[PDB]
């Protein structure tokens, strides 16, 4: 959609571990 949106925060999880890769279980992915 061409509309505008605001992405408010939901939750913060402090774990302090390095992350380098991710995997999922149609979807768009950006960087």
């Amino acid at each position: 959609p061409q509309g505008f949106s605001a992405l408010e925060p939901l939750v913060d999880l402090p774990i302090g571990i390095n992350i380098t890769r991710f995997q999922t279980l149609a979807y768009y992915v950006g960087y």
Partner: protein, 49 residues
Amino acid sequence: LLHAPATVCGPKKSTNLVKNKCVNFNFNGLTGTGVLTESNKKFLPFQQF
């Protein structure tokens, strides 16, 4: 005591709230001086400052 973020600590001391008297205060690390009164403006559910 590791480099991981702290998740357990000691308790805090809370006191009574005062109004119409410009005194010192400390909410979540914020320290200043001034009068305290209610307001008509409303914040967002997540915003705190």
